[PDB]
Structure formats: structure tokens, C-alpha cells
Amino acid sequence: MKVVIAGRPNAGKSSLLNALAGREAAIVTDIAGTTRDVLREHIHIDGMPLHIIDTAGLREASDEVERIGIERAWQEIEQADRVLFMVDGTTTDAVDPAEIWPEFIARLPAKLPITVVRNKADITGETLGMSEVNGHALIRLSARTGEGVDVLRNHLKQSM
Amino acid sequence: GMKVVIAGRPNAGKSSLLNALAGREAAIVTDIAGTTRDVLREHIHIDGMPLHIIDTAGLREASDEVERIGIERAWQEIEQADRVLFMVDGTTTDAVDPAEIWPEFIARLPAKLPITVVRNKADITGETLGMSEVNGHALIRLSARTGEGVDVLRNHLKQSM
Ligand SMILES: Nc1nc2c(ncn2[C@@H]2O[C@H](COP(=O)(O)OP(=O)(O)O)[C@@H](O)[C@H]2O)c(=O)[nH]1
Ligand SMILES: Nc1nc2c(ncn2[C@@H]2O[C@H](COP(=O)(O)OP(=O)(O)O)[C@@H](O)[C@H]2O)c(=O)[nH]1
Ligand code: ALF
Ligand code: ALF
Ligand SMILES: [K+]
Ligand SMILES: [K+]
Ligand SMILES: [Mg+2]
Ligand SMILES: [Mg+2]
Ligand SMILES: [Se]
Numbered sequence A: 001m002k003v004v005i006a007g008r009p010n011a012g013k014s015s016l017l018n019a020l021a022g023r024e025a026a027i028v029t030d031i032a033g034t035t036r037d038v039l040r041e042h043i044h045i046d047g048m049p050l051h052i053i054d055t056a057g058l059r060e061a062s063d064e065v066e067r068i069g070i071e072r073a074w075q076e077i078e079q080a081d082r083v084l085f086m087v088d089g090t091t092t093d094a095v096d097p098a099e100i101w102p103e104f105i106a107r108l109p110a111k112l113p114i115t116v117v118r119n120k121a122d123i124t125g126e127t128l129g130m131s132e133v134n135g136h137a138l139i140r141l142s143a144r145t146g147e148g149v150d151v152l153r154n155h156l157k158q159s160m
Numbered sequence B: 001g002m003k004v005v006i007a008g009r010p011n012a013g014k015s016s017l018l019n020a021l022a023g024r025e026a027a028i029v030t031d032i033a034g035t036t037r038d039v040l041r042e043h044i045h046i047d048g049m050p051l052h053i054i055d056t057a058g059l060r061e062a063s064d065e066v067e068r069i070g071i072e073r074a075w076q077e078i079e080q081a082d083r084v085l086f087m088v089d090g091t092t093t094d095a096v097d098p099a100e101i102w103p104e105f106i107a108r109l110p111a112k113l114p115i116t117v118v119r120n121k122a123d124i125t126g127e128t129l130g131m132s133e134v135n136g137h138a139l140i141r142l143s144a145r146t147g148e149g150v151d152v153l154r155n156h157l158k159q160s161m
Helices: A013-021 A064-079 A102-107 A149-159 B014-022 B065-079 B103-108 B150-160
Strands: A002-007 A039-044 A049-054 A082-088 A114-119 A129-133 A136-140 B002-008 B040-046 B049-055 B083-089 B115-120 B130-134 B137-141
Touching: A002 A013, A002 A064, A013 A039, A013 A049, A013 A082, A013 A114, A013 A149, A082 A149, A114 A149, A129 A149, A136 A149, B002 B014, B002 B065, B014 B040, B014 B049, B014 B083, B014 B115, B014 B150, B040 B150, B049 B150, B083 B150, B115 B150, B130 B150, B137 B150
Parallel strands: A002 A049, A002 A082, A082 A114, A114 A136, B002 B049, B002 B083, B083 B115, B115 B137
Antiparallel strands: A039 A049, A129 A136, B040 B049, B130 B137
């Protein structure tokens, strides 16, 4: 089973992958379009094996390699059993993904389950942990500090 | 499985070989130098021998910050390999001995580490496909793009490891 991390550039997807995999699998920098290739890591939580999949931040890109990466990101989404929609919490106060980026949500395969991840809690000062918005699971965490990531782990085990 | 690290100059065809070995389009391939920066890992089996095939950023003095980091990571993979496939673009040099091609690369490798020299783009150079030896190193001529000579590589990996 496959969990895809997807969202805008610099949301912290690669930072999250590395937190979940417990190794420095993906390059992380503040440059949008750092990740282009699809990065896949095998993990387990508690008897449950899954593939965690990091992808290029979604946009209309003039960088050819990044454009290909973005096409591949959408292809990963097509095959996902769950998507983690990573959001830079510093960029917006909205919590409902329909307010955050309605085109992304509308484009997702029908009934692919979505978890909304508001990252960079360390900057915003948001309360860490889980809640629900319009029926979507919502988690506030810091991929950089690890603060809140166990709540993501338990969530994956319970939900899938 | 044992770690086989694909290393060499940019555009040699490293990702093209990863994809040929893995039997899927795991890495992005383009005519642009510095396409791969992140380390890519593909687990495969050759006649029931498992192997971890590792693709890396082409080694150069890169201006791009992420490519520079990818190049650092490439040397970290090399340091920890069980074997290195030294990928050489046959269209850019007729030298076959790695000591003539890039002595600094060869000298920097960990003492015990076996290397297989791979002369890619045989479809272009018209080099005869298959296996030979240069200064004690296995030397294989193949084309990652057409797949010609890749079976020779798979067989060598099985026999040698
Ligand atoms: N303060 C803070 N910065 C973060 C966090 N997660 C990621 N970043 C930073 O945001 C930038 C982009 O992160 P990265 O994982 O490359 O984003 P990606 O493009 O979505 O994969 C980097 O400078 C990270 O250090 C976080 O939880 N807190
Ligand atoms: N004709 C030919 N072209 C190749 C071969 N292998 C790779 N290429 C081309 O060389 C360019 C670079 O390939 P790529 O795999 O991205 O090289 P890398 O940067 O070393 O990973 C691309 O245009 C490939 O299609 C080959 O065996 N024959
Ligand atoms: F902008 Al990125 F991985 F660097 F989505
Ligand atoms: F130049 Al490359 F992977 F694009 F080594
Ligand atoms: K980034
Ligand atoms: K390339
Ligand atoms: Mg990234
Ligand atoms: Mg490559
Ligand atoms: Se693996």
C-alpha cells in the first residue's frame, strides 16, 4: 500500500519523508523545485507495511526536469491508496482544503482518501495534533522538528 | 541485497542504465546534464540474487546548489558500495583504462572496492558488445538505451557477486 506526499513546492514534503523514513533520503533546501524524481521509501508502523512516496511540488514549471517530475507526481497520485496534502501553514490561515487549493482537491481521483497536513507549526505557533475539516483528517505538525509526527504515524495505522 | 552504485560524469547514461536494470522508468532521463540529483534506489533480482541498484548525480563542478549536494551524496553512496559501475560515455573518449579517463575518481575509491568499467552508448560508437578487462578491472561495452549488452552486465553481476 502506497502513501503519496503531495502539495505545492517548499511545503516540506521531503522533510516529512525523511522524518517518516528515519533517514536523510531526500534532499531538503529552501529552493522550490529541489525534488523532481519520485522518491520511494519502505517503512512499517506496527505490523503494517507501506510505501511512502515523495514527489515534486506541484506547479506549472519551465524547468524541464521539474515539469517531468510534476507529471510523474500526478501519476503517483493516480496509484495512491492515500494522499498526504502538505501545506505550508505559514502561507495561509485556511484549514479547509477547498479554500487552500480547490483545483488540487478537485483533480484528485474520486474517493482517494486525503489527509490534510499543515506543516511548519514551529513558525505559526499552531496547536499540534489531529482534527477534522469537512470530513477530511487534519494534522498540524513540524516535519523539521518532528513535533507532531507520531500523531501522523498512528493515524496511518488506524486509517489504513 | 548488495549495493551496486552507478557513478560517473553527467550525461553518461547512468539513469538510463538504472531503468534498464529495474525494468521500469524509475529515474528521469533527459539530454540535460544534472537531471539526477537525489540518490535513487531500485531493488532488483538477478536469477534470485537480490541487489540494490543505486543511481547518483553525475560528478562535475556544478554551479547549481541542489546538484552540488547531490554530488556530495553520490560520493557518500560510493564510499558505502559493494561494487561501483563506473559509467563512461564512449562517444566522449576512446581511452579504455580508467586511469587515463579519470584517475582522481579511481584513486578516491575505498581500498577494497571492486569496480566494473562500463562503456556506454555502444549503439553510437559501434564498439563490439560484451566483456573484457583493462588493468585488472572488468570492462563491459553496452547500450543502456537499446538494452544491447545489458544481459552481459546482469550475468557479470551474478557471477562476480
Ligand atoms: N520552520 C520550518 N521549516 C520547514 C519545516 N519543514 C520544512 N521546512 C523548510 O522549508 C523548506 C522546504 O522544505 P522541503 O522539504 O525541501 O520542501 P519540499 O519542496 O515540499 O519537499 C526548507 O528550507 C525546509 O528546511 C518545518 O516544519 N518548519
Ligand atoms: N544513443 C544512446 N544514448 C544514450 C544511451 N544512454 C543514455 N543515452 C542518452 O544520454 C542522455 C543522458 O542520459 P541519462 O540517463 O539522463 O544520463 P545520466 O545523467 O548519466 O543519468 C539522454 O539523452 C539519453 O537518452 C545509449 O546507450 N545510447
Ligand atoms: F519544492 Al520541492 F520538493 F523542493 F516540492
Ligand atoms: F547528468 Al545526470 F543524472 F542528469 F548524471
Ligand atoms: K524545496
Ligand atoms: K541527464
Ligand atoms: Mg522536496
Ligand atoms: Mg541520471
Ligand atoms: Se529493499
